[PDB]
Write a protein that binds this DNA or RNA. Structure first.
Ligand SMILES: [Zn+2]
Lengths: 122, 52, 50, 133, 50, 84, 97, 52, 88
RNA sequence: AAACUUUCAACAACGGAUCUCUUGGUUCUGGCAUCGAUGAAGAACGCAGCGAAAUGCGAUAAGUAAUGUGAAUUGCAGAAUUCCGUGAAUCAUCGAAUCUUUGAACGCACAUUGCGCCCGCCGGUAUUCCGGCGGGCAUGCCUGUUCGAGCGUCAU
RNA sequence: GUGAGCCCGGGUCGAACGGCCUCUAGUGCAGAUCUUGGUGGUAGUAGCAAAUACUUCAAUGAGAACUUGAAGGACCGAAGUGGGGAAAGGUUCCAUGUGAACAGCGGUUGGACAUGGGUUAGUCGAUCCUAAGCCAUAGGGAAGUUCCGUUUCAAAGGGGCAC
RNA sequence: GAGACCGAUAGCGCACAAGUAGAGUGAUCGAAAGAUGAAAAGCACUUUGAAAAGAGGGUUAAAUAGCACGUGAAAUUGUUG
RNA sequence: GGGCGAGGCUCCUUCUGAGUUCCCUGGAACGGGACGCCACAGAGGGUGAGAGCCCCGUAUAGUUGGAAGCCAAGCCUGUGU
């Protein structure tokens, strides 16, 4: 008891995950008093309760972020934590379209005189 | 390495009545303090004519 | 195992007990050749000590 | 002679890698040969050893002793075999560490993953032999 | 002194919790080279430097 | 703990005069009166009006500070500014 | 006549990377040839005569063909650098030969 | 002190008349919570806390 | 009496602890750290002390974020999850 | 004659040379381009059943998720693993997360865990009181929005 | 063997090493008040002599001048060898236990060593005020790190009323 | 990835919980320190001591390897001749 | 002017030859002797002493599975505002 697997958590929604988090936190709070009052094999249980709380928090955060990404899928401005990280310099880099933009005179020259494929007889 | 034996702050204690005039590591509170430095004859010092 | 551990803890103190340290916290390195005692000359004017 | 530029013949780097290998690498490092019967049954020469395998000791002062693997001390690069023990001073029993390259596996502790390992080793050996033949 | 700031008292708390000999089970670990606390502090020997 | 100062809690925080409310919402008086009618903000009467405002008279109008705070979020304010 | 009166030891360049740099250049040339195939790896260059009285006996390759050379050969100046011909608008043809 | 009394009420249904706090020399906080006279602290320590 | 007797009067503090670098180098009257130069925006460093530079240089601490950048570069700063991975 | 001093030898001391070893330096060569307000480098304080440090991590704290592997970890204690498996491990990889107080450090300050302001939510008898929680409030500059000022130039 | 040296026997020991011809060098020590480390004679020597001073019984303990209780004798002598604080220290405080090391003699004792415990505020301080003084802002200097500036050559904001 | 490099007083200051311990108000200064054994098999049990330990008896191929630990030079010391 | 595109390349992944045969010394063969085998692998390391064949690896063609790009033989089509 106290070991909650991620597989069962990935199918729950927010309310039962919150309820499970509440019960796990209550058991850990009682078990700390049990630790300071007596010694036993319940230290394994407190370790599993800590890791189960971590798993539940991870799953709740992941589902909330997935829902938010779905909500912000078709919007121009995203929250800064939902924006891709990359590096600061990569984010300041010119976009691919803007870097590939050429002048129209250049475009006419490239349309009518591109680099050709050729060979020279020996 | 070109910096070997020269990463120390050390000065000679001068002509006197007690010790040889090799430069000695300044400071205190450690075994290195007051010990000889920079010489090819010194422990933890620069070798004669370092290889290039 | 407790007896073995206590013996190892006592055997860990032999070098510092030979060096006569007051416990493991005593790591003071004293000046065996102080500069004020091993440099300079006593002139005819002011002296560094009486 | 090694040819590939990613291969190093440095003794220092080899010993550093060997004695600082993590646990999954140490599992591959403590491999043991199979017995002749198991080799002809599975077309497999060697496998990483594990707890529950039955081995025969073929080197050292405990040669020809047989038993089950009771522990794989990967931290000490050693395995423990049941009844291959010695007596302490106090009259208690302490296991004797045996390197897995000094034993031969006579019975495999079989599960689905071990069968997958044996099957893919056999398939690779047959494919290589067919390609080179 | 009795008058002290919170930051100073926090640093003194950390020093008090650090002031201990090593657990005896450390010496029984495989390949252990730690024999004692080489950074052990005492109030008479070495100053905290605050 | 630290000694409180006079006039920083109680009715002085509970009530606002109409002048304070209009300046707080940054509205003109016709827009404010229109919005109070439409949102049901009603005049109120403190027990001691001097504790709210020392220049208050019998004709001074008071409102709840929380009601004015609620009016801060009404979408009609941006409609007013857009029409202007 | 030894010029070692400055701190010369800070600016000594040895050349232990000479075979490595040859290998790097050969790898770059092979990559360039593979990218350019079946075109030649280089551009066609004209024949020019070296300046000064010491070297005007000898001819060598120049930078690129002149505009009047391209016009007399019937190659338009926009087509020429796309078919492996180097073009030099600065050089002029002072003589017929 | 307000956070401590709210947490005690939320966790153990404990009502306190006053709370005194100190920070121990090790760096942790210690709280003396005096309970209301109608409630028995020995009973709470026996059942809810298991301190016998 | 410029030695031992004078040394008994040493009970003040020229420097306290600096909030930026943690050393006992914050001059209590000038409010300037002698080591890191706080509260100036730049951290104090000089080319006449290679040792002092190497005591505080990048890599001598924790590299809480910078140590993970080479792995993300090696995988190309990719985003997302492996195909078919369990999750939301 | 002994003792003492000195010399020679054997054994025993003292001390750590010599020899052998080397998960370390040093030098050369080849490849690569990737820090930070989306809060870096650095600092502080914490986190393990039993750790002070080193190492790892951040109140999800010697770690969580995911992928892979496929039976450990180990100094002790305690549990394992349905072994024909949503699965051990101080395992590897690593694309999802968490990431205390700080620091260019950003409400104002900081030798103070000092003092604020704005907007929400919750609880305690509560339209006023008390408490808790969440989101915000630095500077320079650019584009734009909106509210303005001046007989500065005009129209009417 | 003239020699620098080379070779062998015996003892110890435990994992590598040598001859010959060439190649190569960080290649040969008694000195440098040489460097680092280690060790002598001096020598069981100089000394352990300021602050008036100790004694008896019992207990504890392997062991008691310097542990404890009692019994005596003294000293500080209220500008104290007393009772409390500021700076500074940081757990030295309290209880229990203790081999070595330390307490220039001893030690059962200890500020030592080991494991634990201990610091409770609306009223005491900090927190607030300003002093001498220091630092932002406007603005002006300076290649610049930055310097001056603190009321200025600043559009630097408060209140009230309104059908 | 390598070397006609160095082999723990060398080689980076650092082969080790090293930019650590320690010193300085501060800027800064800045060490020493690697090797039991193949495997802890790290000495059961008896005996003498208050204890540390000693002696028997053991482990080991070897304790002439006893967590002062490979080898174990010299200065210098003890005993025996 | 557009759209396909066989095929190729780059990166991680599954897999690869042959003695633990007999005698002697030894605490332990990885030493000595004999008889074999592999080798596009006799680099390096580990294993109780110098191991190609005990173990990891090492050589060479390939061979499983996946992702993102690039190059590219050719092939469909609009036609001149
Ligand atoms: Zn600082």
């Amino acid at each position: 008891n106290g070991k909650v697997k991620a597989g069962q958590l990935w199918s729950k929604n927010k309310e039962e995950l919150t309820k499970i988090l509440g019960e796990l936190k209550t058991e850990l709070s009682q078990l700390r008093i049990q630790k300071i009052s007596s010694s036993g094999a319940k230290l394994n249980k407190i370790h599993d309760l800590r890791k189960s709380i971590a798993r539940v928090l991870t799953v709740i955060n992941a589902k909330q972020r997935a829902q938010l990404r779905l909500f912000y899928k078709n919007k121009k401005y995203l929250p800064l934590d939902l924006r891709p990280k990359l590096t600061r310099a990569l984010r300041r880099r010119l976009s691919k379209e803007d870097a590939s933009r050429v002048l129209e005179k250049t475009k006419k020259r490239l349309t009518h005189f591109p680099q050709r494929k050729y060979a020279v007889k020996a | 390495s070109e910096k070997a034996g020269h990463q120390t702050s050390a000065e000679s204690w001068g002509t006197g009545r007690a010790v040889a005039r090799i430069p000695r590591v300044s400071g205190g509170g450690t075994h290195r303090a007051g010990q000889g430095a920079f010489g090819n004859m010194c422990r933890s010092g620069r070798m004669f004519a370092p290889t290039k | 195992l407790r007896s073995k551990a206590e013996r190892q803890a006592k055997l860990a103190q032999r070098k510092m007990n030979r060096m006569a340290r007051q416990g493991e916290a005593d790591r003071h390195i004293h000046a065996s050749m102080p500069k004020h005692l091993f440099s300079g000359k006593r002139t005819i004017g002011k002296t560094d000590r009486r | 002679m090694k040819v590939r530029p990613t291969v190093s013949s440095s003794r220092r780097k080899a010993r550093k890698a060997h004695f600082s290998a993590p646990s999954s690498v140490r599992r591959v490092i403590m491999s043991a040969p199979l017995s002749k019967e198991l080799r002809e049954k599975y077309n497999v020469r060697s496998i990483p050893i594990r707890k529950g395998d039955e081995v025969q000791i073929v080197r050292g002062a405990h040669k020809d002793k047989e038993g089950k693997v009771t522990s794989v001390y990967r931290l000490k690069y050693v395995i423990h075999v049941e009844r291959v023990t010695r007596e302490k001073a106090t009259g208690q029993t302490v296991p004797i560490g045996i390197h897995p390259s000094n034993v031969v596996i006579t019975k495999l502790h079989l599960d689905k993953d071990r069968e997958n390992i044996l099957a893919r080793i056999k398939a690779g050996r047959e494919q290589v032999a067919k390609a080179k033949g | 002194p009795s008058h002290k700031t919170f930051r100073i008292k926090q640093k003194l708390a950390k020093a008090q919790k650090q002031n201990r000999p090593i657990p005896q089970w450390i010496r029984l670990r495989t390949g252990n080279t730690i024999r004692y606390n080489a950074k052990r502090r005492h109030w008479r020997k070495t100053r905290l430097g605050l | 703990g630290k000694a409180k100062k006079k006039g920083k809690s109680g009715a002085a925080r509970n009530y606002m005069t109409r002048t304070q409310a209009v300046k707080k919402l940054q509205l003109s008086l016709p827009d404010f009166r229109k919005l109070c009618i439409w949102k049901g903000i009603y005049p109120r009467e403190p027990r001691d009006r001097r504790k709210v405002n020392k220049s208050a008279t019998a004709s001074t109008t008071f409102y709840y500070t929380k009601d004015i705070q609620y009016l801060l979020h009404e979408p009609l304010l941006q409609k007013f500014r857009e029409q202007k | 006549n030894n010029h070692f009166r400055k701190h010369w030891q800070r600016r000594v360049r040895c050349h232990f990377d000479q075979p490595g740099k040859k290998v790097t250049r050969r790898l770059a040339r092979r990559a360039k040839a593979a990218a350019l195939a079946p075109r030649p790896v280089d551009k066609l260059r004209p024949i020019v005569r070296c300046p000064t009285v010491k070297y005007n006996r000898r001819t060598r390759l120049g930078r690129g063909f002149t505009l009047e050379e391209l016009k007399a050969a019937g190659i338009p100046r926009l087509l020429a650098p796309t078919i492996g011909i180097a073009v030099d608008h600065r050089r002029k043809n002072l003589s017929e030969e | 002190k307000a956070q401590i009394k709210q947490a005690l009420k939320k966790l153990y249904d404990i009502d306190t008349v006053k709370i005194n706090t100190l920070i121990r020399p090790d760096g942790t906080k210690k709280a003396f919570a005096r309970l209301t006279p109608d409630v028995d602290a020995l009973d709470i320590a026996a059942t809810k806390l298991g301190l016998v | 009496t410029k030695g031992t007797s004078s040394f008994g009067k040493r009970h003040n503090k020229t420097h306290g602890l600096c909030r930026r670098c943690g050393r006992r180098s914050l001059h209590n009257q000038k409010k300037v750290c002698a080591s890191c130069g706080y509260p100036a925006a730049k951290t104090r460093k000089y080319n006449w002390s290679e040792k002092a530079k190497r005591r505080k240089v990048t890599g001598t601490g924790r590299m809480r974020y910078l140590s993970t950048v080479p792995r993300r570069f090696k995988n190309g700063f990719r985003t997302g999850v492996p195909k078919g991975a369990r999750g939301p």
